[PDB]
Amino acid sequence: NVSPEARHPLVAAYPIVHVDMENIILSKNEDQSTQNTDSQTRTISKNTS
Amino acid sequence: NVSPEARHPLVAAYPIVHVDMENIILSKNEDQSTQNTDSQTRTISKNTS
Amino acid sequence: RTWAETMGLNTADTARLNANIRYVNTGTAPIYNVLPTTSLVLGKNQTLATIKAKENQLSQILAPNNYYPSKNLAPIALNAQDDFSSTPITMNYNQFLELEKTKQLRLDTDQVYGNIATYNFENGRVRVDTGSNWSEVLPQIQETTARIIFNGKDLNLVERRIAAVNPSDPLETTKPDMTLKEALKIAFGFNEPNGNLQYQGKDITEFDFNFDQQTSQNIKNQLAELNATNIYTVLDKIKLNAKMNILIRDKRFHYDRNNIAVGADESVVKEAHREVINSSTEGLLLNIDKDIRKILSGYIVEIEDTEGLKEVINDRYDMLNISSLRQDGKTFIDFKKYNDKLPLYISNPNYKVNVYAVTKENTIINPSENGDTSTNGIKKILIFSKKGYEIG
Amino acid sequence: RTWAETMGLNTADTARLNANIRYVNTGTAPIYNVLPTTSLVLGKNQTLATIKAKENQLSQILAPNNYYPSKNLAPIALNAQDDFSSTPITMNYNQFLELEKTKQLRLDTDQVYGNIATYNFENGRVRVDTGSNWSEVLPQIQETTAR
Fold it and tell me: What ranges does the record list as Polar residues composition bias (chains A, B)?
């Protein structure tokens, strides 16, 4: 894999690596919740006035 | 990488490493929560007297 | 009957980052088991996190002029900070608000770990020594060699290093003497097919030499001692030394401070479109120089009248895109791209067509400071003007 | 129709720190695999944390008169205390109130770990021996020399 111009004794052979970023994906850490409730009641009452 | 002055047998070659702080980022850990709710009711009072 | 709704948060852990990266090797040798250290910066210099790549992001081999993962594949994800890839990269509330406002987040590359593979003399096999890495080697290359950067091939910066003599070191004065001409010959592929140095039919005098300060001081003293003035006559009498930086660029263009050619001078800007293939109101095929092909932003379409009048179609910043790349190397800039799919309705064949160019030393992204979203802030060059009855 | 709103806290983990650091070598020899131990001091001499650098904060070579990372790059983040970088640095409520009031937080440098690279006679290469550090060497330089 050493490139042919670097097969001379006087030309160095060394890698030049660098990373590049194609996309950033951010994700909002947030928690949500819903609730539904039914409630029935029945009261009977009486007074003696 | 040994610097030229220290290529003499009587000059010592040693590193002097030192860390310096450029920015301090504090992030206040605190959780906050909001809540919206709405409700309807219906009562039918049948009463005798 | 009720109905509720809740929405929590935590202002040290509001968002999580996932970054899609891709590695490039542009050197002259492969590197094995690659693991770059890389830091995510928000804004000017506020670093969120620094992540050495984990086992999921390891490239087993990066041969030169290659990519990992290769360019027909989607990039890899870097989304963890823990040593075992189990804890995400997080950011608090203020950094999240600033990222959503200003959209500035970049990725630095601090260093690269990687191994070396050497020839085993017994069975001929090439074996990776996982004790040695390339960090013990490149600082010995950078201190004993001269560096030459060159963009005479596709206007891309190609960096090489040539072993030259350091005069104040006993082991380094045993290397053979290196001239600038022989360095250009064995490093890039210059030759002298008649007696003159040439890079694929291009003479040496078509390039210019820009040095660093220490290198230019040395070259100036060498030229003073040689009793010469032109560097192009004594190229085989210039001795290279270690820790030199020489930059060789093509003389025609203008460069920014990353040495990218963005704009030529106006004569060769006009001299690039002589032989023409298609000339119709439907499209335009053209044989353009490949060197000046990429330095221009895009062209403008308008129609010159006899009285003196132009009908500006590309009078905006967005649709200065014009190109459509075909399989013959010649783009066909077909004119039903921004015209509601219509030809140029030249109402009188006593008219002329008119095409002007935009270079990236005058190209803007934003509008003007007032209400100007037009081509009022650009400078243009004349190229294309024929008469109107030979178009059809 | 109702609207509520809640806050929360914990008075031993009210805030987390993230320092941006940058190393520098002003000596005459390079040091390899650099890992400084360093200390976050609030106010006069009250120390919040002592962190040896983890694997994300390691410099592979720090040559003389050079920085890590070099000065066209942003500094690196030190934001973890666990050995595997999975636990943040932490201050309580009184420390957070005092840092917001007085804004005094410095960074001491207690020691530096790093290796030595020696010449190899058989093939001329230079090999980092990971079994010998500079702390065996440098106290011998300090006792036989004049500064």
Answer: 32-49
